[PDB]
Amino acid sequence: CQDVVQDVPNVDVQMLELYDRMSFKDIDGGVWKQGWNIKYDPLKYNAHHKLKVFVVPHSHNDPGWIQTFEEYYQHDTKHILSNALRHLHDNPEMKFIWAEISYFARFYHDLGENKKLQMKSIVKNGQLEFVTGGWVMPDEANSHWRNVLLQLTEGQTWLKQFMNVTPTASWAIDPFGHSPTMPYILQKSGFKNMLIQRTHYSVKKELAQQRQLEFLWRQIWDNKGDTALFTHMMPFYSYDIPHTCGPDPKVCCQFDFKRMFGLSCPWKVPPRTISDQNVAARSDLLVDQWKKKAELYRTNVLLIPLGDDFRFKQNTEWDVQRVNYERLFEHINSQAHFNVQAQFGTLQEYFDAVHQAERAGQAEFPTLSGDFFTYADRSDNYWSGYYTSRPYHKRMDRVLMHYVRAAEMLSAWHSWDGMARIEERLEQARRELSLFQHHDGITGTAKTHVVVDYEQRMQEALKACQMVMQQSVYRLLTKPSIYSPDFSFSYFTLDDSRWPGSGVEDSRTTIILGEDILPSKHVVMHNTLPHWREQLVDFYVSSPFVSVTDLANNPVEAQVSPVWSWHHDTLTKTIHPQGSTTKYRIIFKARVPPMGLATYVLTISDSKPEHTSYASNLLLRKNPTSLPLGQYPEDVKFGDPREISLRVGNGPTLAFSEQGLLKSIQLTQDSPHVPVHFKFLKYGVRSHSGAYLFLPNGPASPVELPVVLVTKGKLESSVSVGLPSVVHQTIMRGGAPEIRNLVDIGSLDNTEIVMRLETHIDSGDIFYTDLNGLQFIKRRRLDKLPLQANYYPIPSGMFIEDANTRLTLLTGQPLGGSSLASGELEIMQDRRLASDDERGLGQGVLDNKPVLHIYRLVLEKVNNCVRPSELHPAGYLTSAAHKASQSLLDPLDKFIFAENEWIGAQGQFGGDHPSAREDLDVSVMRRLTKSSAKTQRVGYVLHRTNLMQCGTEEHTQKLDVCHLLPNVARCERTTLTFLQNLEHLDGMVAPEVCPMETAAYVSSHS
Ligand SMILES: [Zn+2]
Description:
Blueprint: E1 13-14, H1 15-21, E2 51-60, H2 69-90, E3 96-98, H3 101-108, H4 114-124, E4 128-130, H5 145-163, H6 181-187, E5 193-196, H7 201-208, E6 214-217, E7 229-233, H8 249-252, H9 279-294, E8 301-309, H10 315-334, E9 340-344, H11 347-359, E10 367-369, H12 391-410, H13 422-435, H14 448-477, E11 492-495, E12 510-511, E13 520-526, E14 533-541, E15 546-550, E16 555-556, E17 558-569, E18 574-592, E19 597-604, E20 612-614, E21 616-620, E22 637-639, E23 644-646, E24 653-656, E25 662-666, E26 674-683, E27 701-702, E28 708-712, E29 717-722, E30 726-732, E31 738-743, E32 751-759, E33 766-771, E34 775-780, E35 792-794, E36 797-801, E37 805-811, E38 815-818, E39 824-832, E40 851-861, E41 874-875, H15 879-889, E42 893-897, E43 908-909, E44 920-927, E45 936-944, E46 968-974, E47 981-984, E48 998-1005
Parallel strand pairs: 1-10, 2-8, 2-9, 3-4, 5-7, 6-10, 12-14, 17-20, 21-22
Antiparallel strand pairs: 6-7, 11-42, 13-19, 13-42, 14-18, 15-16, 15-19, 17-18, 19-43, 21-28, 23-24, 24-25, 25-26, 26-27, 26-32, 28-29, 29-30, 30-31, 31-40, 32-39, 33-34, 33-36, 34-41, 35-38, 36-37, 37-40, 38-39, 44-45, 45-48, 46-47, 46-48
Helix pairs in contact: 2-3, 5-13, 9-10, 12-13, 12-14, 13-14
The chain binds zinc ion.
PDB class: hydrolase
Keywords: Inhibitor, glycosyl hydrolase, hydrolase
Assembly: monomeric
């Protein structure tokens, strides 16, 4: 095994370091606007050192942007691949690369057998080539690493099944910034090489100067060097033909043969058909470009992409590009003076050639670690707005992410008869989720009608996850002797207190109890994590007089709180809460096995149970209306606005300011009231910013201000303020608090609502954000760079720390954030924008809906924690912080029994299940086989995080995922897509995964 805290990795290019050293000066550099005039010695090239040129045709296809997936399919993409099929068939030497399997599958199932076999031919012989082979070309900023794997597996499996192919080269031309989570995943999936485009123009500049655009990209912790994937960064502004042939767009544009008159060259200089008349001169023009570009690479091998957005649509586009290019090649290759071999190639061809050139001693390649955020395409145009854009759907991503994992896991335990339609529903759930991983989905960068389409897809996916989950729970918890299922029937419905969230929609069922009508109700909790988890759960009940027992009929400590619903009187411009008189919240701690189920019973009585406590309700306002709660025991107490100090359990004592905003945290009963000021601030737009670009007009200024609701219970206490736009809540359950905001920006125009945390922590210039919920990276705030440059993705978490203290904020939804000062954390909530970015949308953001954002807040003492070196580019969470994240992203699933009596009800599932070390996670459990298959196969993905040793350790059972199901007959260790066996495990025992490593195993059963 390998240590990731003490031993700082020795890299050629550490990106944080480089960031400290660069000028980031926006120097006009010539025709290559963001570079220089490239000079090459022409006597570099002779017969023994010829230039090898791969011209690589592509179309960039958005699975949704201006148009929906199916719109783009009918209008554009079906034609593209219909021609690719016809042309590559007809033209043996013609090549094409393809990335988006979403469209490829959409096309191939329409094909007519003959067509499928021909499509197979041109794949077999290497003419058509899949690159990455993801369901989509994913966003790398906002996407969770699990969903990155998901989309990958969807596409690559499709490819394995239908095409017999597994791509080992990746292609990422349009993501807005690049994440190291990609090489992490791709290298663990048997990939050999990757390619990126959109990095910061100044980084393109700094790297090109040093011949560092090709590099072995390794993880920020990786000392040993095994995570390292070969990366080709492309050097120019775009992936268009203008920016691909070499440094001069004016030149490059004349070899985009589609442009001769709908399309045209914005350098005024048209392309011209190649003939015997012009060949030699055009050839010279072009070879000079190639050779210029080739100067930026350590080898005499060179990659020339040929295409653009939805290219190769027209039949005649295929001739015009091909024929003209054939003419140039045929010339250049016979003209020995040039010293150039030029041909239509694929991305693998390019890559294999680079390595073959490295075999022949031409180059030794540099090591790089770090990330490629925050991307700027030009001047002070940083793309940090998209970290936040359409935040509803960002939340929705996470919810569905959870529902996918749980539905796959819950149904994994049993083989299912085909009539059950479990496969079909899981297939769809994954696809819809995989689709939203697209760099115009989760980013929030599409048109309104497309965002609508994604929602509908995701809604259907959720509906599908519920069905699979309930059917499964019913099977797992009903005696085999009773189990006699109607696959189409609802045994259970989910309850989700967090999605959409109670302000957002009235979507939660009330359990209706009564002495005559329905005396008691079975509820079931699911725990997807492979450890014992205790967690507070709530349900809506029709009476306060409800007691909780387990199925073993033993009483369970409960709290009843009312059902609060914030109203806005337009009458007053006031944010008042309202009580429900007809429904109540029952809260109790559920204990649930590793990867298991636990049943519970809610029973009514005629009065207060022994073991059910009531919460008091204080409503601080100047001038109250007295407020009925019906049968609720305790009447609402009223008062003038005061400073507050609540505790719950032994877990921390939180002080609140007089308008209900956390003002300090006291950890123990010795520790100081350590100050932590929540503030709300607004940003605006310059007059001198849109769906992609964060363009602020100066520092953020506070929101002008105010009703405060305190609920105080034995299990749970909240503090809830209704400010304009935001209903802010602080919930306390005897650990690190929960922050919920119901954000409605709504009317407020050209505005961006942020959440700041002013602490007296001596962070200085240092903060740490995460990347894809996989890793925490160090960020230095840079005085040189503008504000929006200091904003990073917060997909899951961020933290600041001094020598003694840390404050971590975990999220349940990816947002934008920064530590703009010493002891700050901030994080964007929503953004409404009238102005377009002019990146091709046509709109700003004018479609905002209410969203319930969720957080956790972990203040901690870190002085006796085994801390990484000042030099180390990574951070690592503590137990507390890590569990807080798990609590956000993977909560307990709640199931209410639909009918009146549950004959055959069992109490529990998986009490026999091993309870694995807290730092281990079964990220995926998925059955890989249908019932009508001889051998049942079940894949597992295990991820081991790394946490700070802090003394902090109670013994736990080793988990061997090979033996989680009986009759194991084979356990191979696989690629993360499950598509290739890496290891035969003798004795069918899965070894321990190292910290920061991610393994996948497939177990076979008999
Ligand atoms: Zn795109």
